[model samples]
Target chain A: REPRGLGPLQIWQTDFTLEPRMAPRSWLAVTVDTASSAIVVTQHGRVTSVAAQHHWATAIAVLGRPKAIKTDNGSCFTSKSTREWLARWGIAHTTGIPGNSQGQAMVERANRLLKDKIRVLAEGDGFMKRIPTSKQGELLAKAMYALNHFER
Target chain B: REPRGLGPLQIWQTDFTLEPRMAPRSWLAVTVDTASSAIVVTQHGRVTSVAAQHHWATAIAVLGRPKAIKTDNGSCFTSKSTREWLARWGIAHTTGIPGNSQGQAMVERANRLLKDKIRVLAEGDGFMKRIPTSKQGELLAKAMYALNHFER
Candidate 1:
């Protein structure tokens, strides 16, 4: 039998991926739910503690409280501030097995989809051509919405 | 029996929601899929044909292609430019039943969630005190990431 359909406020999985490797924020943070396939991803590309903190806070608030959250062993996810925030929210954080793709199947898949989409948007003579510097967030959100990449 | 799982590149739904009513294109343009529930929402506001076209173009570039698309009778969607664009893409376009929320429940629900989130963010002592006159797109994206509000 399949796993129980993920309730809206159930288990969550989060991770980060850097588009084009060294593009601005160096990372895009995404939080997804195991049961529902719902997701929350950051539009800003900055990969830093501050950016992570801001995106994390917003994603959590919008996603509501989850029973548990799974994450890989990324420095941003494992940082002191992130740990403290999770504790404050009373969310169970489970993570181990680094660098192995199998470990973060949920968010790992999301990152791949996002990376590919971004490539299409920013590559070739595609509609988006190059990532518009001013409204990066707009582009990301639009992409997520259209591709159904970000779960509702 | 449950609905068949929606595959990618199938059906797509698009809609526009104006936050704060007349807030100078403070509208959010979201493209969602009917079966898959895949979606792309833009932080860039502006209810004009040009803005819609830009968002649509970029979103399509990122989302690849859809078999068919659905939209309401909004003038923007029904505009000549939109028609020409959709026709050029050769994707089937269908619309009707104005003011009827039942027409597009998928996008309708997404819009409600977004409106409510904006309310929470803009009203009272919320994290955001209204979509400021400047950088509305950035703020919407910022709020989306932090609150994960764009999705359900």
Candidate 2:
């Protein structure tokens, strides 16, 4: 089933993407507001339940808290603490089927967009074989700013 | 000696700040445009000539290239290659007196603003002791977005 939303802050899709090509390997926790298509990412060693909460907190501070959030049945998303945290915030939580990509397609596409931008930026400079993980986070912020501010 | 400029893109001051309190020790290359007071930062191991160039390039891409850039007598700003690069781009380069901190006051203030914001953010959530160096870079990005977009 497809995730549905009609306006900004209605629904958000969150996911994690790992890019080993980044220096020290990069784990990006990505969140996308379904209605506005506003996307943000946070870099972590791995996307744990706590990392998920932090990413959402940061994103929500700028994008405003969403009414509901959707994610796949990842351990981080299904953890008891994560559920309790979301419940406390009055955010409805929904999980996509384990193997279905369609339900989380928005965030999946955001993951690709972020990776592609990072690669393009790193390759343009060609100073190192792998882009520094910190640099990746900075580039992701630039991409996020452009995505949210510019009309798509 | 104080840096002088009358309009946006006329003068920019750049500097580096090392925050050992940050996890992995954050090295931030900060640039502040004197006219509009726009600020941006890039994280690096140390602000080498190349890193300085890259930081300005990234900042220029968004904030536009300045007519001239001011900096303290840091090696990164004085190296022959850096001067040659600036000359090639038609960007005038000016260096302050070796011991004079007031010459680069704008960027020094920007550095403090960035560090303060990062600390406030990291301490708020309390998940980690020192904020990740990568997160510092991300917070810098958000701060840049706010500084540039919001009317001050």
DockQ of 2: 0.01
- Which stretches of candidate 1 lie above 4 Å from their native place? A1-9, A44-46, A97-101, A123-129, A149-152, B1-152
lDDT of 2 by residue, B50-146 (tens): 9888888888897776666787777887798888778777676766433433567878889888777766666775724666555666665666675
Judge candidate 2 at residue A49 and give its lDDT.
96
Docking class for model 1 is incorrect
> B52-93 in candidate 1: lDDT tens per residue?
777778668766666456677778877888877777886556
* Model 1 chain A lDDT-worst window of ten: A1-10
DockQ of each: 0.01, 0.01
- Identify the candidate with maximal TM-score: 2
